[PDB]
Amino acid sequence: YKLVCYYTSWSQYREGDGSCFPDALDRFLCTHIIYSFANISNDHIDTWEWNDVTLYGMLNTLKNRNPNLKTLLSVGGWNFGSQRFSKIASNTQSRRTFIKSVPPFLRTHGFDGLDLAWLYPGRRDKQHFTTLIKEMKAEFIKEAQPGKKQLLLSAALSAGKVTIDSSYDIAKISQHLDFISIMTYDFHGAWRGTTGHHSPLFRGQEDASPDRFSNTDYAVGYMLRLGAPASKLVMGIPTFGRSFTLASSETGVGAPISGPGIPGRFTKEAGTLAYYEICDFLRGATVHRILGQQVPYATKGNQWVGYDDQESVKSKVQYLKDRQLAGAMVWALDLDDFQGSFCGQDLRFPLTNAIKDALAA
Amino acid sequence: YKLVCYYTSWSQYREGDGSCFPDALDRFLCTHIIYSFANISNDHIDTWEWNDVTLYGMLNTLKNRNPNLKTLLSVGGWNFGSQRFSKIASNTQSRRTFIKSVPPFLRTHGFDGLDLAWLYPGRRDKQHFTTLIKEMKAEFIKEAGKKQLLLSAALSAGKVTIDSSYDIAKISQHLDFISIMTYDFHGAWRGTTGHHSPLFRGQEDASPDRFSNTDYAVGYMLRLGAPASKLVMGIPTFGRSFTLASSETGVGAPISGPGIPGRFTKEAGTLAYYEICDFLRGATVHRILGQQVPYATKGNQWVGYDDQESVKSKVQYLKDRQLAGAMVWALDLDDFQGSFCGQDLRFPLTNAIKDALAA
Amino acid sequence: YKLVCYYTSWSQYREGDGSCFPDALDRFLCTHIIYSFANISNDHIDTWEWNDVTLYGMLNTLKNRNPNLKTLLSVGGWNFGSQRFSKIASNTQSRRTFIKSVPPFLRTHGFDGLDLAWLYPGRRDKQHFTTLIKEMKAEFIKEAKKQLLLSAALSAGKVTIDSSYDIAKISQHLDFISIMTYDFHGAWRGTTGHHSPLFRGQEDASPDRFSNTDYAVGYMLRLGAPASKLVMGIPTFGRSFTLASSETGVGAPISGPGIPGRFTKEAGTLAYYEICDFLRGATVHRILGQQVPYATKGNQWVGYDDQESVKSKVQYLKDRQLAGAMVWALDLDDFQGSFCGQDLRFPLTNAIKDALAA
Amino acid sequence: YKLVCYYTSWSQYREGDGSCFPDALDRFLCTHIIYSFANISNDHIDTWEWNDVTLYGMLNTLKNRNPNLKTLLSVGGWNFGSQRFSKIASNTQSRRTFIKSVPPFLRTHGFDGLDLAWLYPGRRDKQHFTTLIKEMKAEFIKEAQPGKKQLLLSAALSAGKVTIDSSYDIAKISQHLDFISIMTYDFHGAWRGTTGHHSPLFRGQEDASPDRFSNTDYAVGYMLRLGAPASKLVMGIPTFGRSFTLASSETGVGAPISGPGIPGRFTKEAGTLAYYEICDFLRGATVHRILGQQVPYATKGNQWVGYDDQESVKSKVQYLKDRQLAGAMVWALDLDDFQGSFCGQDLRFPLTNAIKDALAA
Numbered sequence A, D: 001y002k003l004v005c006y007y008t009s010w011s012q013y014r015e016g017d018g019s020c021f022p023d024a025l026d027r028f029l030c031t032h033i034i035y036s037f038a039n040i041s042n043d044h045i046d047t048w049e050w051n052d053v054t055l056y057g058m059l060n061t062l063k064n065r066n067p068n069l070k071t072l073l074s075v076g077g078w079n080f081g082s083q084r085f086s087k088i089a090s091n092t093q094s095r096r097t098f099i100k101s102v103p104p105f106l107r108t109h110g111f112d113g114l115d116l117a118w119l120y121p122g123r124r125d126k127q128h129f130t131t132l133i134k135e136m137k138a139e140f141i142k143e144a145q146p147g148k149k150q151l152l153l154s155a156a157l158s159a160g161k162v163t164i165d166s167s168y169d170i171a172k173i174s175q176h177l178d179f180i181s182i183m184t185y186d187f188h189g190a191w192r193g194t195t196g197h198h199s200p201l202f203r204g205q206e207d208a209s210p211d212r213f214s215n216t217d218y219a220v221g222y223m224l225r226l227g228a229p230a231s232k233l234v235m236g237i238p239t240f241g242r243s244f245t246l247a248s249s250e251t252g253v254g255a256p257i258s259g260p261g262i263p264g265r266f267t268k269e270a271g272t273l274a275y276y277e278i279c280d281f282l283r284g285a286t287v288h289r290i291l292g293q294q295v296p297y298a299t300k301g302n303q304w305v306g307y308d309d310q311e312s313v314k315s316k317v318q319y320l321k322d323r324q325l326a327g328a329m330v331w332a333l334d335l336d337d338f339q340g341s342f343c344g345q346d347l348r349f350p351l352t353n354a355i356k357d358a359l360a361a
Numbered sequence B: 001y002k003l004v005c006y007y008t009s010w011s012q013y014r015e016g017d018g019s020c021f022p023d024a025l026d027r028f029l030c031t032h033i034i035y036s037f038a039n040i041s042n043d044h045i046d047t048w049e050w051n052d053v054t055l056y057g058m059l060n061t062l063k064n065r066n067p068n069l070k071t072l073l074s075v076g077g078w079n080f081g082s083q084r085f086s087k088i089a090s091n092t093q094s095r096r097t098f099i100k101s102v103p104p105f106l107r108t109h110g111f112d113g114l115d116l117a118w119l120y121p122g123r124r125d126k127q128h129f130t131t132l133i134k135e136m137k138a139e140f141i142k143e144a145g146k147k148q149l150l151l152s153a154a155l156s157a158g159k160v161t162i163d164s165s166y167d168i169a170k171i172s173q174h175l176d177f178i179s180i181m182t183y184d185f186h187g188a189w190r191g192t193t194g195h196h197s198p199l200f201r202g203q204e205d206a207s208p209d210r211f212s213n214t215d216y217a218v219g220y221m222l223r224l225g226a227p228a229s230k231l232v233m234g235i236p237t238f239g240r241s242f243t244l245a246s247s248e249t250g251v252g253a254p255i256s257g258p259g260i261p262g263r264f265t266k267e268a269g270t271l272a273y274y275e276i277c278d279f280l281r282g283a284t285v286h287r288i289l290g291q292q293v294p295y296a297t298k299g300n301q302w303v304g305y306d307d308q309e310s311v312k313s314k315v316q317y318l319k320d321r322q323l324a325g326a327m328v329w330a331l332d333l334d335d336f337q338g339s340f341c342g343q344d345l346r347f348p349l350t351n352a353i354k355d356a357l358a359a
Numbered sequence C: 001y002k003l004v005c006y007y008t009s010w011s012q013y014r015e016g017d018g019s020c021f022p023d024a025l026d027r028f029l030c031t032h033i034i035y036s037f038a039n040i041s042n043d044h045i046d047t048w049e050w051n052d053v054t055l056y057g058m059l060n061t062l063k064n065r066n067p068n069l070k071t072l073l074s075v076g077g078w079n080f081g082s083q084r085f086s087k088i089a090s091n092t093q094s095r096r097t098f099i100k101s102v103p104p105f106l107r108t109h110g111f112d113g114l115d116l117a118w119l120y121p122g123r124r125d126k127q128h129f130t131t132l133i134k135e136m137k138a139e140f141i142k143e144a145k146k147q148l149l150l151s152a153a154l155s156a157g158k159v160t161i162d163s164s165y166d167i168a169k170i171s172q173h174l175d176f177i178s179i180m181t182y183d184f185h186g187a188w189r190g191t192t193g194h195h196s197p198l199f200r201g202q203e204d205a206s207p208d209r210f211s212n213t214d215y216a217v218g219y220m221l222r223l224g225a226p227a228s229k230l231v232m233g234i235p236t237f238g239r240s241f242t243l244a245s246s247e248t249g250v251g252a253p254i255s256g257p258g259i260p261g262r263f264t265k266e267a268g269t270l271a272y273y274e275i276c277d278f279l280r281g282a283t284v285h286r287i288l289g290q291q292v293p294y295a296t297k298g299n300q301w302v303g304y305d306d307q308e309s310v311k312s313k314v315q316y317l318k319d320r321q322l323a324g325a326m327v328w329a330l331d332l333d334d335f336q337g338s339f340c341g342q343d344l345r346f347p348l349t350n351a352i353k354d355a356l357a358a
Ligand SMILES: *[C@@H]1O[C@H](CO)[C@@H](O[C@@H]2O[C@H](CO)[C@@H](O)[C@H](O)[C@H]2NC(C)=O)[C@H](O)[C@H]1NC(C)=O
Pocket: A039, A040, A041, A042, A047, A048, A049
């Protein structure tokens, strides 16, 4: 199995113990570490953060003691602009320049491949996305034709049915990608204004959800039916939680909310909490396992958070193994307790290690 | 919460330690114990087993030490005959006679209610079923300075049967409680393994419909108008077994037929919890993701059953839904002797249900 | 069948022939006419427009030639304030004051009932709304001269219904419910879609199965509303968009709301009389599974209702045995009779009236 | 557009004016006529009816005056045995023998192609079905390599979501099939105990529908979403009706029934009526058009029949043209008023002609 883990470069800026640089990562933890994100400027792949070159080096040094470890650079991301990516992919020239720029940039900076993170192509971009992937793969084959280790090509795809139907021609792109990381988290499955877990394994209570597809199981089954080979599908597992501010004494799934949860001390984004911030939150909280969904939520005062713990990530791994998938993808290393100090057991990357352990069991 | 438990009169005939008589039951276990089954001959409610009157007494004796414990007799069952029950229900005369014969027969033998177990009304019987229930409740009402006789019904949890034969919104007005039989589901693809009592659907592309599970049935009855306060969720103490046809042993694996009969229950395809505890020695147990229930497999045998862990999840579910309580099928299929499941505790599953309801 | 029709007071301000006053309304057209909207000040129902009293007068004057015509006053509206209405209804004292204030105000001004238009109660207001309606009806029974009528305009949106209304309870006390089956979010984000389809139609051409008239009516019926108390909303206006490409079908990309109408001046909306003008040189397409039309011309697209579609909607409500139809709104139909090419006033409302009687 | 029409060889046996042989067919009516069904014996495609060779000849004679008309032979059918077809398709040797036997049988008998009508592959047959289709197409390509007109390969597929999910890998088989005829009819079995139209265009009144997928629109949309190109999808339109015996004075959609309708004089099958039988039934009956489903039903006394008429097949064609599908498929020519004498208009094939005209408009 593959254990693909994302490292986000903006996590270096979090205050104090929240600051995460590549040298804080365990070189033997993942099979593939993906650095996010690279920019596309003047149609050439390029760095994003001022010190990306330094951080690329910190990341690639992990391979010194672990030859098996592969690294990839992810281009795009949420702050890129779906519109701007679209412009680059639809223009014959821009697309060629972009593709031509990638292999030298990866060889020059020590990466083993590229991860495409166009988040997300819209209706009107389905064929351009397919074309971009086919051409990018063709370039990697050409670059390596004279005996080199061929560069890997992956893509982070939405797990949302609406986006999959409008933007991806799954059977076609699957033939060219080395693997697909399906982003099975950040689901918007709760009725507007109510609590709901953002990464349930299954739909759960039948009459309590807006739809049948805002869950991991549905998304995975859908992509498999559309033609993604199980051997190329890597299932996303989050290390973060999605939070809400409760509007009443009700605390179950579907309880009324007044908005996103209070921002965490380190991540500072209303509605999200890193696993290490959740560990702090859990002191004084009550944890409840959602019966039909195989995942927990915790609640304390007027706050409620749906997240994943060691027990739930092991269940998600059991699921992906039962389905013979390629492995797990983790978003993200800097959101797991990478310091090993917040979740009272003195062990770094508790969630990611739980996933690694389950894949090996 | 109500903890409604069924006792089956034909369990007495079971070999050795399998034999179960009402005196072997724990008087403080359930809130309601239901005796199954009564017959209908010449349109009058009548005993089924030769020694039925003897068993009725053993059962009600349990009430001497427990003031609160309640008992009911269940008329119908799988061997009664839907064909027969229909004729009795449809026919105006036969219906009045039957109804009339009920209160007396109960009082005499000392029961506190009637449980209708018509399995199951056909499409042409939906109205007859509603009338029978309304009129039966009527006769119970026109009788008190005593305690009013309770009226309950055991209903299919199967969507097709519910749609074709029950007028839920109407019959629920008159029933004191509905016991939904959320087990013995036939949700697996034909010729394959599947759990007969999953709490949820589980993997979406691994079953034909999303209807064959406890959650769907409970939600559908609440959707059809059944008040939560009158709904008691069925939890089985038995497992449903199969004979595997290949090396595959997961959910959905091919089968050649029902599992080998249990040493005591001797019914291919079914195993009492105490027989499962024996089967578990040397077996591999897997908890089904999303369904919240276990299956065990050993050699060419495979069985989907309920254990302390799963009945507790089922109780947690019913309490979150604010249902009336739990129904157990059946006391005689739990480890009532207390000596088969290595703990040396009688009624391990029913007790687990009792403790979870109180939790 | 009831034919409940809204008249909006702000329509008096529209320019030229768009100006609409109660005295422009045909007194035999509707069975009930609701005046929108009244305010609530210092916890007492009160007037909104500076000339409301004069307008109340013109309305009720319609009852002279037609004795069986009823009129109601709607309180609330979109400009009222969901939070405000909440403050009033969730405080025992304010609630009592408001309810007490209602009967006399209605009697004094010639109204036969009150229409509650709290748009809309939030999740924390479901019980409060039920209590407000129950106590308001009790006051009406107590005060009864013909008992005053109490109706309510309810959202047709599943989420709002689930969060805001205890349908079984409030429907026992209301004389009728007008379900607002229009202004649905009938389109995938950033694309065209009809705002008032009768059925869902092509399943992949609309975001969900709830945003249509049929779903909302079946839902309210399932939740306990007696069919005999449910009045189905039919719009006489259209919802428009500005196209972003050469595609013009349902689901085509848009860049924003449609160009405002000359008279209604509201981006994204068009009165039927404005649409009749728009139709000259336009192409009309009947949406197959939705039983309603859209028209397109140049970079504009509008989903609306016409005589054929309002007649299908009436056929549907009659088949469902509903209490009747609600029309929003008289001032948006061609009340002048001059814009649609056949010198006949209220073409749409008259089409509904004819369908109800047929 | 394509107008694919089925001729069933058992219709020759119907009493009197119901007997239909290929020489009663209009050579200019359809673009493709499919003869149903051929057998597979000793693993070789073979005839089924005693006089099939004669009837093949009558059918192909129709191309004499119409060079554009194509004919295909359908193998399988309801009386074949899905398990028998499965044994053939799963065994390597049996499969090869069958595939090898097809081109020579088609050339010898004057057919332009083969229609696969395995009704239906089981859960364990999905991959075997894909392989059968791929190898068959490969044999057709090989047979024509030396410059011949390549033989056509089509498949009649279930429109039932449950069957599609268990039996077909849509994305893959649609790559090798020249066209797919989706059997969008026979959606409301009498087992449900209520009246329901068997071929509605849309779901319609939501609370009157058993589910979301038993309608033409869902099945078409679903196959498109699963990867079948619109240009290879031919939508089935029935010329027959599905009938029921009413159990009460209620006659609308969802009314209680006691079972299938009384058999027609010529088709002699409870629950089905050919369009020419429906025309006789309509005298004295009341026709109701189902608002949200765009199709009619007729009722008279204790009988109720859901069917298609000139107005509804016209709407179905409008629908398929709007979706840019390849065309329409008609089941079946012998069930339309082929004599032209039952529907009081003196014109043959009224329903098939209304479809032809709508496709051309
Ligand atoms: C990523 O690359 C794009 C280049 O396309 C950068 O965007 C430009 O930024 C400059 C400086 O503010 C602007 O003047 C241009 O208008 C931008 N171009 C476009 C087309 O938007 C962007 O700043 C880069 N991001 C980073 C962090 O390097």
